[PDB]
Amino acid sequence: ESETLNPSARIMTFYPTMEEFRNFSRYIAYIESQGAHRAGLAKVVPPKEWKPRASYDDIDDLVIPAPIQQLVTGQSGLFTQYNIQKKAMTVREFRKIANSDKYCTPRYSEFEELERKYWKNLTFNPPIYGADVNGTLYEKHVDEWNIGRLRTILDLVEKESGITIEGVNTPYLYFGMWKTSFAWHTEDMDLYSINYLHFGEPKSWYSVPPEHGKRLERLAKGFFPGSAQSCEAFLRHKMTLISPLMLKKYGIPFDKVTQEAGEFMITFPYGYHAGFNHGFNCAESTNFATRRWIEYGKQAVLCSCRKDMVKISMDVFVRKFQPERYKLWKAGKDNTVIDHTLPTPEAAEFL
Numbered sequence: 140e141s142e143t144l145n146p147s148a149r150i151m152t153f154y155p156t157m158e159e160f161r162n163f164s165r166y167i168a169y170i171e172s173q174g175a176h177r178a179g180l181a182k183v184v185p186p187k188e189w190k191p192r193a194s195y196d197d198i199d200d201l202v203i204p205a206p207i208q209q210l211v212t213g214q215s216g217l218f219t220q221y222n223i224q225k226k227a228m229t230v231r232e233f234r235k236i237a238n239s240d241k242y243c244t245p246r247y248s249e250f251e252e253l254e255r256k257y258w259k260n261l262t263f264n265p266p267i268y269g270a271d272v273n274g275t276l277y278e279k280h281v282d283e284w285n286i287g288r289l290r291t292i293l294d295l296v297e298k299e300s301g302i303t304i305e306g307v308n309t310p311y312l313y314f315g316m317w318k319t320s321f322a323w324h325t326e327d328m329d330l331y332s333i334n335y336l337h338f339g340e341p342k343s344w345y346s347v348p349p350e351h352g353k354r355l356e357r358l359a360k361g362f363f364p365g366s367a368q369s370c371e372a373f374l375r376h377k378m379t380l381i382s383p384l385m386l387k388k389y390g391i392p393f394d395k396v397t398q399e400a401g402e403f404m405i406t407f408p409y410g411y412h413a414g415f416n417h418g419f420n421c422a423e424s425t426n427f428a429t430r431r432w433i434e435y436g437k438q439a440v441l442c443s444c445r446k447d448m449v450k451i452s453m454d455v456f457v458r459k460f461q462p463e464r465y466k467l468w469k470a471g472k473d474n475t476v477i478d479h480t481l482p483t484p485e486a487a488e489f490l
C-alpha cells in the first residue's frame with residue numbers, strides 16, 4: 140500500500156495552503172502519506188502571505204563566533220573537507236568577504252553549469268562558512284513552522300531531562316557564500332531536520348533514499364577504508380564529499396533539488412544528503428521527530444571515536460510509545476526490522 144506511493148523515491152515539492160501550514164506535525168504526516176519520505180528529502184513551499192520576519196536588516200551586526208574556512212582535498216569525485224576555524228566576525232563583515240570578487244559566485248547560464256563549476260573548483264580558494272550559529276531569525280509570534288518551537292515529540296528530551304543539544308533541539312543559523320559545502324550525512328540519531336532559507340542565493344541539495352542508504356555507506360567504506368576502520372560511522376564526521384557522477388558511476392540512486400530563498404527543506408530519518416550554497420545566503424535549521432523516528436533512534440549507528448558526539452537516550456521514547464517492547468528492548472532481544480517505505484502512524488488521519 141505504501142510501496143505504491145513515490146515508487147521512484149523522487150524528491151517532492153509541496154504547496155500547502157495556509158490552513159494546512161498551521162499544524163506542523165500534521166503536514167509532516169501528510170507528506171509522508173504521499174510518500175515524500177522515500178526520497179529522504181522534500182521541499183515545502185510556504186504560502187506567500189506567510190513570513191517569519193518582517194525584515195532582515197538588523198542583522199549586519201549579528202556575530203558569527205566560529206566562522207569556518209573549508210579546505211577540501213581530493214580528486215575524481217571523492218573529497219575530504221577539513222575545517223579551519225577563523226576568528227569571530229559580523230554578518231556585515233561576512234557579506235563583504237562573500238560578495239568580494241575573490242569569493243563571489245561565478246557567472247553561468249543553466250544550473251547544470253554552476254554545478255559543474257562547483258565540482259571542478261571545490262578544492263580551490265577555500266571559502267568561509269558562517270555555520271552552526273546559535274539563534275533564530277523568527278519573529279516571536281510566528282506560530283507556524285517556527286524552528287524554535289515546532290512542538291514535536293523530540294521535546295521529550297528537554298522536558299524529561301533538562302538537556303539541550305545545540306542545533307538538534309535548538310536552532311542554528313548558517314551564513315553561506317559560494318562553494319561552501321555540507322558533506323554527506325544523516326542527522327544525529329537519524330532524526331528529521333527542517334531547513335529554512337531566510338534569504339540570499341540558493342542552496343542546492345543531493346539526496347539518497349533511506350531504502351538505499353546502506354548502499355551509499357558500503358561505497359563510502361570502500362572508498363575510505365582507513366576512516367571506516369577507525370569509526371563505525373565516519374560519515375557523521377561530516378567531512379566526506381562525493382560527487383553525483385561518482386554516485387552515478389557506482390549505481391547509487393539519488394536525486395537533486397535546489398532550494399530557493401523562502402523555501403523549506405525537510406530531511407527524513409536515515410536520509411543521506413549533501414550540498415552547497417550558491418552565494419551569500421542565510422539558513423536556519425533544527426532537528427525534530429515523529430513516532431516513526433523512534434525505531435530509527437533505537438537503531439542508529441553512532442560515531443564511536445569522539446566523546447563530543449550527540450547521543451540521545453531512547454529510554455523515554457520506548458517507555459511512552461513502545462511500552463510492550465521495553466523489557467524486550469532493554470534485554471537486547473528487540474529485533475524489529477525497519478521498513479523505510481512505511482509512513483509515520485500519525486498519518487492515519489490521511490491514510
Ligand SMILES: O=C(O)/C=C/C(=O)O
Binds near residue numbers: 320321332333422424
Ligand atoms: O545548511 C547546511 O550547510 C546544511 C544543512 C543541513 O544538513 O540541513
Ligand SMILES: [Mn+2]
Binds near residue numbers: 324
Ligand atoms: Mn543535515
Ligand SMILES: [Zn+2]
Binds near residue numbers: 371373442
Ligand atoms: Zn567517529
